Design a protein around this nucleic acid. Structure first.
Length: 205
DNA sequence: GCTACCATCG
DNA sequence: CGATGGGTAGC
């Protein structure tokens, strides 16, 4: 809460457009879930690939409802006891079903960095480490860093939607390349996650 | 009523 | 290459 206040004040100290956007959108309501284990955050991030928040939620809901006896997130063991065929019925694509099964195996076999180690890793180190997982690359690791880890300076410059918002926000003539979004949002440090969140709220206006 | 909107695999 | 998951905003 205090972090967001500070972030909001910083974003309101850059050029005029950031100040205006923050005022119109209001307080940042981003709610990460660092209590989630790495395998859960990773699976949630994989599921969201190419899908809206609502679509992703309906899939995870079925997943938790069917593959869990307490409606909580399925444990690695439970996921392992489920064949890809059944996972696909939940709404996971066939490819994602395979990847999620592998992530579950990895968690069970202690092949995924522990949450403790993940917390000591810089984003660059997290990228190098988690990118070793099939189905997990830049975008997915950024989402995991934002929505699970709660990191505050993550700019998912490669996000298609954010790029569309950046085009409008910065008054660009064409959808910007990832490198360009990175350059334009530099002033937002060290709260680029919050800056991204605000850009993501532009449609809701 | 329509339908556009991550990362992997033969 | 060309498929791929699904709720829903914009038409």
């Amino acid at each position: 809460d205090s972090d967001y206040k500070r972030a909001e004040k910083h974003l309101s100290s850059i050029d005029n457009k950031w100040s205006s956007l923050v005022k119109k959108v209001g307080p940042c309501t981003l709610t990460p879930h660092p209590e989630h284990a790495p395998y859960e955050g990773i699976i949630r991030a994989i599921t969201s690939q190419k899908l809206s928040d609502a679509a992703t939620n309906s899939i995870i809901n079925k997943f938790c409802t069917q593959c869990s006896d307490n409606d909580e997130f399925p444990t690695p063991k439970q996921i392992m006891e489920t064949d890809v065929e059944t996972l696909h019925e939940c709404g996971f694509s066939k490819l994602k079903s395979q990847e999620i099964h592998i992530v579950a195996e990895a968690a069970l076999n202690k092949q995924i960095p522990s949450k403790s180690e993940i917390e000591k890793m810089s984003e660059e180190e997290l990228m190098e480490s988690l990118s070793k997982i099939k189905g997990v690359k830049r975008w997915t690791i950024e989402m995991y860093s934002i929505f699970t880890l709660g990191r505050l300076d993550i700019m998912p410059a490669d996000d298609s939607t954010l790029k569309n918002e950046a085009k409008e926000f910065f008054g660009l003539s064409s959808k910007p390349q990832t490198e360009e979004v990175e350059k334009l949002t530099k002033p937002c440090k060290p709260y680029r996650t919050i800056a991204a969140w605000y850009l993501w709220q532009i449609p809701k206006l």
